[PDB]
Design a protein around this nucleic acid. Structure first.
Lengths: 103, 134, 64, 63, 384
RNA sequence: CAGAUCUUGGUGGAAGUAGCAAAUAUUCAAAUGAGAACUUUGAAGACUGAAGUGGGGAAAGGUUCCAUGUGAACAGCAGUU
RNA sequence: ACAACCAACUUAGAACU
RNA sequence: UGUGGAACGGGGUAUUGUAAGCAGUAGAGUAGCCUUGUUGUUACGAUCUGCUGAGAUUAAGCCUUUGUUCCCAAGAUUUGU
């Protein structure tokens, strides 16, 4: 059951509160990576380019307060005993929702 | 100044060199605060006054016989807000004062505009010559 | 690989700037073997190298 | 022990809330907060803003 | 020339961080043997501040029989559990502890004070002592009798019930509280009877009592001389900065004097504030905690939305006029006054008329949710 | 020769210290590679905003131009460039 | 003396908001 | 392994001020067609009105939660009267 996929909502506002404007988008990427690392227990996190586009959609200093992310812990083309997390973006109307196990 | 007793400490909004309106009918309009009675010794601190104090002022605009001289005056209104013992912060629309003598008796006869309760209670002559009190 | 020479040749062939030169990321090996203007033209004909369209500068608000 | 009413926002004012402004025409105004006081200084009408009780009463909000 | 007073007091030195956070009693009240056996200190947690409107009872004052608004500090004081007794001999080198007697069973709260990694540990703190208490019942009596005959000074060990507070910390605060009754034998007997028992705040302090609050002030880190000592700002023309002191010293003595203001730590210091008056000892079991005789609303001592960064006070609390050192949720030490209060201000009974329960999270204007509902009528989230 | 603020050369404490902060700003994925924050490709976000960080020349330089390889020294961090 | 459109930028004024 | 923690969600508390969308001839007026009009048919029109004390934010050093989903019973170093 190591291979799994879950949809989370990350509250980016409280993580980007006191951050400088020129570093908000890069730090949002970093906090997303740490967010995926903590929840999936995998040290290797790959961010989808479309998710990076979504994070950078409104510039470097205007990141959405909440982001609907899809975290997929899965196998890699490297050794078959290493787990890594792949993070995507989910298109929803209201991102205010609970975490769901997707199948 | 041995008028009616003691006054509670209030925020000082009228330091030296402040220009305030003259609320009496003595013919003055531009009371220029020169010094404040009861000011202690403290380095670099400008002597400031609030409502009910006994500042020393000169007349910059008004009747010529009232200018080029120092006369006692009492501050009746101030723009700076001050709180009372009941926890109410209050302030007026302008800084105003009335020309008096060292004994506290007003040189004028009538007071234009509202007056502070602290000043009215401190000086009976001002209370007698004033209308609306706060 | 290193496609700096190929991008410069593609810009010269397409008569556009290097900012408007698009190269297929899935054909890096094929693009890297061009090394010539004739091969760049072959890549353009095959669609592996294209000229990106100009950025939008609409004048609807100005006209209104 | 009396609760007053703000001159601008018309809300209940408990002791130690807001400020008191005495105008030159002997009129006393009670402001419940700096927002109401600043808006009064900016000469905003309390009947125009939708969040004031005066507006709601004049526009029959609540019935 | 132009003489001016000193900037700061050379009595609160060094201006360093305090070596403690709980706050300790540096001097207990002088013991009077005629008085009944009682404690001289208590521990609480600062919950926040609020308003108080009361009628002044000061003859000769302009505000006599008038309304006055004063700021008060709320300290939540749940009952403290007594778990030990300490006896102090009176050697010519000072007070010296002779022996300590502990209760049969110590709760998890007080036992966590003895550990830095409680969960990782085996929790074998009072194991052999508990075995000795259970199966001997002779050495405990021997030590108590030793404290009876020797140990002119007797202090009990009491720990706070921090689990009843809305605080994330589970480690209770343990403190030695002196007993200032008489008959050192009776003091030991009182401690033995109160072993594993809870002493309440109303049994230690009473209404209108003047006490002292002991605690560590808010931490502020390093600070320049301008804000650390109140020195004058240098002119705008000053090269290489102005928030400093111009002349740090003269020539011979060719050293920087200890009396000169220097940059450094400016917070987190141990302070004892004298003459704090108890305005209300409220109990946590009644719904009229914040009500008065002139305001009969059924409300407790908590602003709507909760105390800022503290929570909801559900235990006994003490309301003190003015401010106390330390930030919110910090543990504070309440100590009985060492002085005698004969002034009219100290002896004046205090009758609260209204207690503010509006939200401290903003410009709150409602005292109760019922009042908020009455004013706002029905909302969109209420109609459907 | 112990001196001459001696001559030439080598080497210390300061010291892993001062510092490597002007010119708005980088991010994600892939390829290569032993090694990728600096290489290349794609995508996004930006700047120069035509008196430009664009395209050319005069003076001056002299091969710095181009391709293919390398990463010993230089590019005050790194390097597959 | 009338006059069917195309192709132009200004200036001044009024009401409303 | 626990009156456990975390990520969300809910409620409360606060800030601002009535979101988008729809509808209304309310709207200074303007322009075409005919049964020719004391709610004219057609279209545009800053703005205004009703859904709407709405919408948005709400810890990042606010409170609370019985809700949903995960995580922990690990690893390394030192220590003897």
């Amino acid at each position: 059951n190591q291979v799994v996929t879950r949809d989370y909502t990350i509250h980016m506002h409280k993580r980007l509160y006191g951050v400088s404007f020129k570093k908000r988008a890069p730090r949002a990427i970093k906090e997303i990576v740490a967010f995926a690392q903590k929840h999936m227990q995998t040290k290797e996190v790959r961010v989808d380019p479309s998710l990076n586009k979504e994070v950078w959609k409104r510039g470097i200093r205007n990141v959405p307060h909440r982001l609907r992310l899809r975290l997929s812990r899965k196998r890699s083309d490297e050794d078959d005993k290493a787990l890594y997390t792949y993070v995507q973006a989910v298109d929803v109307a209201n991102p205010k929702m609970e975490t769901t196990v997707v199948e | 100044g041995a008028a009616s007793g003691t006054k509670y400490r209030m925020t000082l909004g009228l330091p030296v060199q402040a220009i305030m309106n003259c609320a009496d009918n003595s013919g003055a309009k531009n009371l220029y605060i020169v010094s404040v009675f009861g000011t202690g010794a403290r380095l670099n601190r400008l002597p400031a006054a609030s409502c009910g104090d006994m500042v020393l002022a000169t007349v910059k605009k008004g009747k010529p016989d009232l200018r080029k001289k120092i006369m006692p005056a009492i501050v009746v209104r101030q723009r700076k807000a001050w709180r009372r013992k009941d926890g109410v912060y209050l302030y007026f629309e302008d800084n105003a004062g009335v020309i008096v003598n060292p004994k506290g008796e007003m040189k004028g006869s009538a007071i234009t505009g509202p007056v502070a309760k602290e000043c009215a209670d401190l000086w009976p002559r001002i209370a007698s010559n004033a209308g609306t009190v706060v | 690989a290193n496609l700096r020479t190929q991008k410069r040749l593609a810009a010269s062939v397409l008569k556009c700037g290097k900012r408007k030169v698009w190269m297929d990321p899935n054909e890096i090996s094929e693009i890297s073997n061009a090394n010539s203007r004739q091969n760049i033209r072959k890549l353009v004909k095959d669609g592996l190298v294209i000229r990106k369209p100009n950025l939008m500068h609409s004048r609807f608000r100005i006209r209104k | 022990m009396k609760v007053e009413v703000c001159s601008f926002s018309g809300s209940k004012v408990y002791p130690g809330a807001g400020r008191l402004f005495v105008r030159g025409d002997n009129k006393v105004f009670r402001f419940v907060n700096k927002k109401s006081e600043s808006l009064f200084l900016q000469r905003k009408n309390p009947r125009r803003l939708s969040w004031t009780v005066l507006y709601r009463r004049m526009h029959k909000k609540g019935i | 020339k132009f003489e001016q007073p000193r900037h700061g007091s050379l009595g609160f030195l060094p201006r360093k961080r305090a070596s403690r956070q709980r706050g300790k009693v540096k001097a207990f009240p002088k013991d009077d043997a005629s008085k009944p056996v009682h404690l001289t200190a208590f521990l609480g947690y600062k919950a926040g501040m609020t308003h108080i409107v009361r009628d002044l009872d000061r003859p000769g004052s302009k505000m006599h029989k008038r309304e006055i608004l004063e700021a008060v500090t709320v300290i939540e004081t749940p009952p403290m559990v007594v778990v030990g007794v300490v006896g102090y001999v009176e050697t010519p080198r000072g007070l010296r502890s002779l022996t300590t007697v502990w209760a049969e069973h110590l709760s998890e709260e007080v036992k966590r004070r003895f550990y830095k990694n409680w969960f990782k540990s085996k929790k074998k703190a009072f194991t052999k002592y508990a075995k000795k208490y259970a199966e001997s019942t002779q050495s405990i009596n021997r030590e108590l009798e030793r404290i009876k005959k020797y140990c002119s000074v007797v202090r009990v060990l009491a720990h706070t019930q921090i689990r009843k507070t809305p605080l994330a910390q589970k480690k209770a605060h343990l403190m030695e509280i002196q007993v200032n009754g008489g008959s050192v034998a009776d003091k030991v007997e009182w401690a033995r009877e109160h072993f594993e028992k809870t002493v309440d705040i109303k049994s230690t302090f009473e209404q209108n009592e003047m006490i002292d609050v002991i605690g560590v002030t808010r931490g502020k880190g390093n600070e320049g001389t301008t804000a650390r000592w109140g020195t004058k700002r240098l002119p705008r023309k000053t090269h290489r900065g102005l928030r400093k002191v111009a002349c740090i010293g003269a020539w011979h003595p060719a050293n920087v004097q200890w009396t000169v203001a220097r940059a450094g730590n400016a917070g987190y210091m141990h302070r004892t504030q004298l003459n704090s008056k108890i305005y209300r000892i409220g109990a946590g079991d009644d719904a009229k905690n914040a009500s008065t005789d002139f305001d009969a609303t059924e409300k407790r001592i908590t602003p709507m939305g909760g105390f800022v960064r503290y929570g909801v006070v559900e235990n006994d609390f003490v309301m003190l006029n003015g401010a106390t050192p330390g930030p919110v949720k910090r543990v504070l030490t309440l100590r009985k006054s060492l002085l005698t209060h004969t002034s009219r201000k100290a002896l004046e009974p205090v009758s609260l008329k209204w207690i503010d329960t509006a939200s401290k999270f903003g410009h709150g204007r409602f005292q109760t949710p019922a009042e908020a509902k009455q004013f706002l009528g029905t909302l969109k989230k209420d109609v459907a």
